[PDB]
Amino acid sequence: EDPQLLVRVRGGQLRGIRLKAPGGPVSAFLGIPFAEPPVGSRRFMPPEPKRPWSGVLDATTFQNVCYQYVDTLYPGFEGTEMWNPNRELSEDCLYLNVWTPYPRPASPTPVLIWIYGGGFYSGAASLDVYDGRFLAQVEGAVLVSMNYRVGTFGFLALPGSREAPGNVGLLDQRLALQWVQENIAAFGGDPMSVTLFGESAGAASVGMHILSLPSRSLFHRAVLQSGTPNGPWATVSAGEARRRATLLARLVGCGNDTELIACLRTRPAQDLVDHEWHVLPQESIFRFSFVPVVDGDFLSDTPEALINTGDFQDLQVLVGVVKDEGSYFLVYGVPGFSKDNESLISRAQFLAGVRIGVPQASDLAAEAVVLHYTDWLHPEDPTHLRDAMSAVVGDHNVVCPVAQLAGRLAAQGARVYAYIFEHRASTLTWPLWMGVPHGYEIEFIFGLPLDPSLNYTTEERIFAQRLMKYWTNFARTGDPNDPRDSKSPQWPPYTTAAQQYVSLNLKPLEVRRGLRAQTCAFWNRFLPKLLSAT
Amino acid sequence: EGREDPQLLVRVRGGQLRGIRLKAPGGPVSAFLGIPFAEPPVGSRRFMPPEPKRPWSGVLDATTFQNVCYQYVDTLYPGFEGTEMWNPNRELSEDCLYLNVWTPYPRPASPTPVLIWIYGGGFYSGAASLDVYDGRFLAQVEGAVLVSMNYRVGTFGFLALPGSREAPGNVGLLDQRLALQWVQENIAAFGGDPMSVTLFGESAGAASVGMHILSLPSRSLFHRAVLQSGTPNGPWATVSAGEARRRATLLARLVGCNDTELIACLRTRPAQDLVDHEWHVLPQESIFRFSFVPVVDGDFLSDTPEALINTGDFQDLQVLVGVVKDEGSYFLVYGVPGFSKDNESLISRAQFLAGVRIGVPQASDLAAEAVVLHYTDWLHPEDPTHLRDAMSAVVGDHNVVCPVAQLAGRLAAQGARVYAYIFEHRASTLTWPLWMGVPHGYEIEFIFGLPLDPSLNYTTEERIFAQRLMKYWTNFARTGDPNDPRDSKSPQWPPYTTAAQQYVSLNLKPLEVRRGLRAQTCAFWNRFLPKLLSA
Ligand SMILES: CCN(CC)CCNS(=O)(=O)c1ccc(Oc2c(Cl)cccc2[N+](=O)[O-])cc1
Numbered sequence A: 001e002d003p004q005l006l007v008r009v010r011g012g013q014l015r016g017i018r019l020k021a022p023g024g025p026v027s028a029f030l031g032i033p034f035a036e037p038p039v040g041s042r043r044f045m046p047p048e049p050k051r052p053w054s055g056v057l058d059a060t061t062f063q064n065v066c067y068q069y070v071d072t073l074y075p076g077f078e079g080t081e082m083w084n085p086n087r088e089l090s091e092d093c094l095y096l097n098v099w100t101p102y103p104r105p106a107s108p109t110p111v112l113i114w115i116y117g118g119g120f121y122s123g124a125a126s127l128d129v130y131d132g133r134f135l136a137q138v139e140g141a142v143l144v145s146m147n148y149r150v151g152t153f154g155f156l157a158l159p160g161s162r163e164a165p166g167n168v169g170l171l172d173q174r175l176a177l178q179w180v181q182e183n184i185a186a187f188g189g190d191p192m193s194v195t196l197f198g199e200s201a202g203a204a205s206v207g208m209h210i211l212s213l214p215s216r217s218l219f220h221r222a223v224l225q226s227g228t229p230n231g232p233w234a235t236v237s238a239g240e241a242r243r244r245a246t247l248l249a250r251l252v253g254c255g256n257d258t259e260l261i262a263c264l265r266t267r268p269a270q271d272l273v274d275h276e277w278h279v280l281p282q283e284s285i286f287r288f289s290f291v292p293v294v295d296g297d298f299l300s301d302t303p304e305a306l307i308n309t310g311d312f313q314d315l316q317v318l319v320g321v322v323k324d325e326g327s328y329f330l331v332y333g334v335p336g337f338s339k340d341n342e343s344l345i346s347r348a349q350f351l352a353g354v355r356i357g358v359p360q361a362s363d364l365a366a367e368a369v370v371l372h373y374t375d376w377l378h379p380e381d382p383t384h385l386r387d388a389m390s391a392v393v394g395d396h397n398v399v400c401p402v403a404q405l406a407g408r409l410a411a412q413g414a415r416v417y418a419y420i421f422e423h424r425a426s427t428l429t430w431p432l433w434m435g436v437p438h439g440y441e442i443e444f445i446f447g448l449p450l451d452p453s454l455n456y457t458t459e460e461r462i463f464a465q466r467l468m469k470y471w472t473n474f475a476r477t478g479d480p481n482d483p484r485d486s487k488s489p490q491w492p493p494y495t496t497a498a499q500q501y502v503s504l505n506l507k508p509l510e511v512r513r514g515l516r517a518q519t520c521a522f523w524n525r526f527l528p529k530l531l532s533a534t
Numbered sequence B: 001e002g003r004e005d006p007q008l009l010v011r012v013r014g015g016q017l018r019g020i021r022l023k024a025p026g027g028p029v030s031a032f033l034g035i036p037f038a039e040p041p042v043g044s045r046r047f048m049p050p051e052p053k054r055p056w057s058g059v060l061d062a063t064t065f066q067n068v069c070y071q072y073v074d075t076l077y078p079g080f081e082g083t084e085m086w087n088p089n090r091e092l093s094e095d096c097l098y099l100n101v102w103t104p105y106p107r108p109a110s111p112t113p114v115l116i117w118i119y120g121g122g123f124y125s126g127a128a129s130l131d132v133y134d135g136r137f138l139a140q141v142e143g144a145v146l147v148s149m150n151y152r153v154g155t156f157g158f159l160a161l162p163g164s165r166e167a168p169g170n171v172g173l174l175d176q177r178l179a180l181q182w183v184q185e186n187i188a189a190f191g192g193d194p195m196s197v198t199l200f201g202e203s204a205g206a207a208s209v210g211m212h213i214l215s216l217p218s219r220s221l222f223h224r225a226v227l228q229s230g231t232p233n234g235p236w237a238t239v240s241a242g243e244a245r246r247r248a249t250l251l252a253r254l255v256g257c258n259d260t261e262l263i264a265c266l267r268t269r270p271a272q273d274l275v276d277h278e279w280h281v282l283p284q285e286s287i288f289r290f291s292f293v294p295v296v297d298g299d300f301l302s303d304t305p306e307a308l309i310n311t312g313d314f315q316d317l318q319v320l321v322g323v324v325k326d327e328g329s330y331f332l333v334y335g336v337p338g339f340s341k342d343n344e345s346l347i348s349r350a351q352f353l354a355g356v357r358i359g360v361p362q363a364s365d366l367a368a369e370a371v372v373l374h375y376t377d378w379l380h381p382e383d384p385t386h387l388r389d390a391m392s393a394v395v396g397d398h399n400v401v402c403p404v405a406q407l408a409g410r411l412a413a414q415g416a417r418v419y420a421y422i423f424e425h426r427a428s429t430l431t432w433p434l435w436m437g438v439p440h441g442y443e444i445e446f447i448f449g450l451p452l453d454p455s456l457n458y459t460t461e462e463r464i465f466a467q468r469l470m471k472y473w474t475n476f477a478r479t480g481d482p483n484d485p486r487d488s489k490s491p492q493w494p495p496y497t498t499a500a501q502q503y504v505s506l507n508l509k510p511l512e513v514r515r516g517l518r519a520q521t522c523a524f525w526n527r528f529l530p531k532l533l534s535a
């Protein structure tokens, strides 16, 4: 019985497992319940804290993945499968994971909390690319990740009703954060230094914790990778959430709010997932059926209203995007695209794909987009059209949303560091044309190249160490810069005046100004005036 | 006769002419100045189409320049060379339909390609007698026969009550066409070749050339065309029948006046009264807008220039088109607050927003917003120097560079042989401030070969450059191709095509070929704005 693996939290005793990382052992505690199983009558409802337990709870194993849609576009292809659930699916899924160094830290140690993405319809903390052992071993960090309910189970809402008020998936995350405040000190964690980081939908969630006051006393710093709470996909209005929820009930055969949610509770999990996609208003990509809702509760107003007016004086944030944000999505709806060919498109297919990548666009707004992205030197050239299609999706959904957030935060007192990630993995399985797709910086942040058996290059390994350093230095201090290291060029704060950001890749840090400034001005400043002239 | 130079006596359909032996740096040239080509359009002929000049008796003296067509005279910078050089240099009169001819001395042995100059000046000003239009250098150095004509400008040239007979409009254009017919009948008497005639003009003159390409009766009067910083399409060169009526009607009121009665009362007005109120009929506060310009009458212009260029066949048409590097700057000091030739014109963001509305007067609030968003540098949105240069570029692109791009793009796609250039050299002798770069109209002095004049204090490189330009233009006149046949070692000037969008830079350095004529920005003006404005 290893006493390093024995921990007492407020709910009872836990037994963890000693895992081997390349540089040494780490203490892992996997499958720790933080809520009562949100099953039966608890479906669609806010989570409740986990009841105390007897004896020693076995926390040596990953728990079940929250019930969710499992992707089928490319069956058995490692590029898509690496994101699919690697455990059994269950509604009973509210568990978190903790990695610490072995032996347990003597001094209180900065805490990183990871929130996965997956469009708020999917994801799990058990995925191999979320393995916290590397950051724990190498950087001596304490790393936490939770499962939260996705899809209908986490975000279906009849706004204003008591039995489906919406945003419960976000409340799951909030509860896990409270759990860290109450318990992390027992793992050697510092509850007075908690950094949230997340990617895509996870970055958006982190964003919403910034914007929801009850979450604010539970963390001190934030990192948003390729996702924002603002933007076209991360939230819906109370009106639209209600429409979709009502439609889904209709598709599965279902006080009218009360009776409707009751019939839904009798439905087998897979029955809801079966029709989950059928409630989107238009044919689209980068749109998800059940996402956070502007309830006037978790989110008092829209994310844009909130960032446009909020006071972010004592906040420190690290934000960024990968080089080819939109490429991944094209194969998932835009005719002409595939991972099995170069995806060279005609002008016709480019026009058609623009109504899909910008589903909310009027005829005139989509005309504006097509005219902005066409290279008038090569207006017909297939390679340019394919690359521009991908840029439209990435800019509309990620890059410009990010630029807007970085800008509003910086102006209103927040401390901001911005990056773009430009290194394509040598082990990447998607075709060359997709470039550096949405989500492929993650494996580097988490330290995976340090595992010899993954066959990353030495340079990639050296690079992963650099990134773990930036992230953890940022966690320690709110500044990704090494504190006593001179040489290695400095990473400056993003500001509204100078708009400085850096490129993360194999070469030394390079400072650039303006994050797609002209193009984002088009999305962030002009288009809203246009669509509002409809 | 008896004792005069026998090389200066010539007969044309209207009678005998005595010209003058002018000195040019390289040798003598013959000038025939002030040849009348129409009956003086005065009295009850005001606003009417020109009638052909009636034969005279005796030998008409053609040694001096004739009257300048009655016009507004610029008062912004009194005595300043940069404006004055464009002002009338002869007496102002409604009796002003005269043309000038320069030929080699003695007159050429074989038929020589003819060049016809059409001056610009916004259809409200201009004269063929300006120093900068001196054909003596082209004639001496290239052996060219050069013809320039006066045509009516302003109200007298373009006031129209469309559909009426007393003021059908476009009579200024008909003045030009009559001179073209004059050249057809008479130029061979000077040794010119009537079957090889190339029109060339700058600004409004260029637009005029464009109108002649688009007007059936003009088409048999020339063979090749050059358009310098102006197009028949675009925001300023034409007005609809409706708008012209509104402006004629308003100008009548402002001077105290059934279309017959109205027009008859205008004919009673002293010419200066019509000129004094000419600017007052513009619908909005603007720059690069002129009150009386060609109208779409469905006669001279059977439809809008835009329609015509989009749907016309232009096989076997050869055109040279181009622009200067800073088309817009000149206009800013005449209307956009913050701009002056006497300071650096560093403006604020506020002044930029105000200025956009003035330089794009026909834009809704949203269209104006789009222009500001497109032209703003978002890395430095408040930088006075960028804002100043952006203002210039907004005006220049909207009015010239993008209409020229559209023109070249349509003509090329529809069969024409098109050659395109950008003129990038700032004259060492330029009196405008540096910030204005290479302004509208400052390629002209080089095309005409003024630097060859020793007393003008240009540089040796400017002299050589000027000579290169005269060769391009004259080679194009002769062949339809600006390249020297022998000189193949020197870099070639490729045709402009839709596929490759090639044009050349014209500066002190050898020809550099570039691709795309403000391709991205012009997609905004030419493709997107018309969609936006119509909503
Ligand atoms: C979380 C990290 N990420 C990195 C690629 C892995 C995948 N999650 S993700 O990036 O949100 C994501 C990616 C592709 C998606 O395509 C679909 C699909 Cl599968 C079904 C229906 C509709 C669409 N669509 O976009 O219209 C959806 C979500």
Ligand SMILES: CCN(CC)CCNS(=O)(=O)c1ccc(Oc2c(Cl)cccc2[N+](=O)[O-])cc1
Pocket (backbone or CB within 6 Å): B074, B086, B119, B120, B121, B122, B202, B203, B204, B279, B286, B287, B288, B289, B330, B331, B334, B335, B440, B441, B442
């Ligand atoms: C043809 C050669 N050109 C070269 C610059 C010389 C001058 N003609 S021009 O270029 O059309 C020209 C230039 C500026 C002008 O400004 C004025 C003026 Cl002067 C008076 C009243 C109103 C405005 N305006 O634009 O609003 C007018 C005509």
Ligand SMILES: *[C@@H]1O[C@H](CO)[C@@H](O)[C@H](O)[C@H]1NC(C)=O
Pocket (backbone or CB within 6 Å): A453, A454, A455
């Ligand atoms: C390289 O890594 C792979 C796993 O991706 C492993 O299976 C293999 O044994 C390693 N070396 C090779 C190429 O055999």
Ligand SMILES: *[C@@H]1O[C@H](CO)[C@@H](O)[C@H](O)[C@H]1NC(C)=O
Pocket (backbone or CB within 6 Å): B455, B456, B457
């Ligand atoms: C040219 O230069 C001389 C001085 O060498 C000067 O007197 C003359 O006025 C100048 N001419 C012009 C037109 O600038």
Ligand SMILES: *[C@H]1O[C@H](CO)[C@@H](O)[C@H](O)[C@H]1NC(C)=O
Pocket (backbone or CB within 6 Å): A336, A337, A338, A340, A341, A342, A343, A344, A345
């Ligand atoms: C590969 O792309 C092409 C179009 O460029 C298309 O034929 C096909 O849908 C894609 N892949 C396959 C084999 O389905």
Ligand SMILES: *[C@H]1O[C@H](CO)[C@@H](O)[C@H](O)[C@H]1NC(C)=O
Pocket (backbone or CB within 6 Å): B337, B338, B339, B340, B342, B343, B344, B345, B346, B347
């Ligand atoms: C030039 O100076 C400033 C711009 O630097 C401008 O505001 C002003 O109007 C101009 N001065 C004059 C004399 O008009």
